RNA sequence: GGGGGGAGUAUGGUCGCAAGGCUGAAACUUAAAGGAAUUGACGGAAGGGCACCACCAGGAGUGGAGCCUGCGGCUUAAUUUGA
RNA sequence: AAGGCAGCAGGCGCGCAAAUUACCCAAUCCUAAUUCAGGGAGGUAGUGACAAUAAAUAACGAUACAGGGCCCAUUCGGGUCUUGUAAUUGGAAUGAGUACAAUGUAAAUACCUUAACGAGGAACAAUUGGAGGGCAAGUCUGGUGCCAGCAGCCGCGGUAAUUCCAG
RNA sequence: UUUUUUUUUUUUGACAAAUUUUUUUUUUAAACUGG
């Protein structure tokens, strides 16, 4: 019974099968296609620096009716260009075109946040200082 | 329209608030002497 | 009550009282919650803590019109300005935390 | 096909403990059959045994006591060695302190306890409490 | 077989003057899609009753006319306003 | 004509991403014709919140209001039982640091010792995230009004926001 | 003498977005002499 070979001599059948059945897991196959290295916008790494190419405004999805104040930007050393969030308010003035950001995953493994479509990155750094000290005076930007 | 986002108003709320300050107050024990404030304020009965 | 006796009793003992208080931690306090009980099993009517005969009168001006406002006074006490609105003249139950934090912003000595 | 007569065995007799008898027939029955039987006997899982004599293979009428929760049989019959055998009394044993977990070595089938004190080891068979 | 899509799509192979089968991804996107049952509501579903705020058989009409009386609209310094 | 730092230190570049062009053969050992010379092997120090261990930011005291329940009660009182708010004071102890020395060391630095200084809220002042649920902790106040924003997820915000910005 | 036995159908398209949320309280009836 049971549907799998049950027999002393048959261990080549049960790890074929295994190896077979893996792939339709969603992150071993990510692990033995290198999909990080080639598809996706970071080249695998946590974070990644870009270049600010335009302030963008995203409404943000149902049920919640704001404007979510994002930006576009154009990554070093790959040339890709992706959409990254702006956090809490204000900042989207401390961010500039051409300011050279520093940038994050946003949380969920390559996948969008909350009411925000579309968006799977935000900004930590933006002229090499924090988001966080420009946000509390706690640091001041350098003039650029 | 659904082509663009208002960027004019970032920071809207943040400006208008009534900013207050920090009122100044005695500092509060560090360390093991916190717990001690702290496991008492929860457990005085008599 | 506040370290009298607390670690005075706790000479080589160290448990006498140690139970565990009501347990909010930021609701305030019980100083009415023995008479909650009192009006919930007497089966008539109880006055609750009358009027505010002369610590209305007297301490309105000497809080308020010294410079003050009551909608800057109910701020820095943290409530609404209906409440010490009511605690001008008359026309309210007065409980003791919000007549401590009135004294101890203000200073005037009434209680 | 019959695969293994042991495992039709054990599975009539655990069918019929379920169902509040006190006697099957098996057939057919083997050596194998004979001497778990024989473990299950001298611990007092079940009764009195009468093999019946065809010229084909035999039959068994085992007479049942209650008493008995589960017999089963493990396929396949893995090696076991010395040291692994509290790796199975532990998975399939409903506590330490009863319970045997029959197997098959060089000296003879035999429940787990008695290897331990012959201290020997082998194939398992199967289990009963 | 391993959440729903993208998609039985793309690419390569194969069966080939055909339709098309077989094998078969990924990028990207998504917080549910789904199964069985429960209580309501609904049906241009059924069965059983009931009502002149339903009909049938009729009566008196109203809608047509003049007026006076509310409402809308228009006007107005305002034509106060609710429904 | 000359070259090969994936030796040591350093530079440029690349990037999310990584230290001083320092001192010495005194230890560990290696080589040589060799006890002696040599060794960026190696060791010492600098940078270093990669990780890991131990554990300062205070300890003893003295001093008071405001209630509430119940009891006895004249009504003026106690006499318990508990609730909160501090707020003014005192002598004691110590190292974080500054350092004679000695110790440490190839020579130093630092540690371990130690003369002399070194605590009263102004400092010698602990932060980082949170307070609807998961998930511990406010239905307190001011601002905003589906805006700003929050929110890993469910959700919050359209004029009484326990969820944003603040105290 | 199983014996009873209502035959039917023209037309009826549509209705924007968000929402309505409930927790288990008594820790309080605890006071007595030894002469």
């Given amino acids: 019974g049971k549907g799998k070979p049950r027999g002393l001599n048959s261990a080549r059948k049960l790890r074929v099968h295994r190896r077979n059945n893996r792939w339709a897991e969603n992150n071993y196959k990510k692990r033995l296609l290198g999909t990080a290295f080639k598809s996706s916008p970071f080249g695998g790494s946590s974070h990644a620096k870009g270049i600010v190419l335009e302030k963008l405004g995203i409404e943000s999805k149902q049920p919640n009716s704001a404007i979510r104040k994002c930006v576009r930007v154009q990554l070093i050393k790959n040339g890709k260009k992706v959409t990254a969030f702006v956090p809490n308010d204000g900042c989207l003035n401390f961010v500039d075109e051409n300011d050279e950001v520093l940038l994050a995953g946003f949380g969920r493994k390559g996948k969008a946040k909350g009411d925000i479509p579309g968006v799977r990155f935000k900004v930590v750094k933006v002229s090499g200082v924090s988001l966080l000290a420009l946000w509390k005076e706690k640091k001041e930007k350098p003039r650029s | ?46 | ?111 | ?129």
């Avoid at chain 3, 109910?74 to 009511?86: F, H, L, Y």
Wanted: charged letters at 30%; proline letters at 3%.
């Fill in chain 4, 1 to 129: 096909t019959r695969s293994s007569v042991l495992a039709d065995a054990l599975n009539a007799i655990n069918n019929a403990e379920k169902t509040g008898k006190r006697q099957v027939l098996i057939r057919p029955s083997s050596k194998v059959i004979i001497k778990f039987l024989q473990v299950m006997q001298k611990h007092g899982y079940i009764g009195e045994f009468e093999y019946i004599d065809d010229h084909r293979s035999g039959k068994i009428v085992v007479q049942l006591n209650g008493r008995l929760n589960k017999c089963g049989v493990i396929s396949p019959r893995f090696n076991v060695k010395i040291g692994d055998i509290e790796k199975w009394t532990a998975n399939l044993l409903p506590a330490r302190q009863f319970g045997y977990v029959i197997l098959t070595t060089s000296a003879g089938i035999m429940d787990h306890e008695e290897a331990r004190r012959k201290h020997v080891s082998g194939k398992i068979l199967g289990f009963v409490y």
């Fill in chain 2, 1 to 46: 329209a659904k082509v663009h986002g208002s960027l004019a108003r970032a920071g809207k709320v943040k400006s208008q608030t009534p900013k207050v300050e920090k009122t100044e107050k005695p500092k509060k024990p560090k360390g093991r002497a916190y717990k001690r404030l702290l496991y008492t304020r929860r457990f005085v009965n008599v």
């Fill in chain 3, 1 to 111: 009550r506040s370290q009298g006796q607390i670690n005075a009793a706790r000479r080589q003992g160290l448990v006498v009282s140690v139970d565990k208080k009501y347990g909010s931690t930021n609701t305030r306090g019980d100083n009415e919650g023995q008479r909650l009980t009192k009006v919930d099993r007497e089966t008539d009517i109880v006055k609750p803590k009358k009027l505010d005969p002369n610590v209305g009168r007297a301490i309105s001006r000497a809080r308020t019109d010294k410079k003050m406002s009551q909608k800057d006074l109910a701020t820095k006490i943290n409530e609404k300005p209906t409440v010490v609105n009511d605690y001008e003249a008359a026309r309210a139950i007065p409980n003791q935390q919000v007549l401590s934090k009135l004294e101890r912003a203000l200073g005037v000595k009434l209680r």
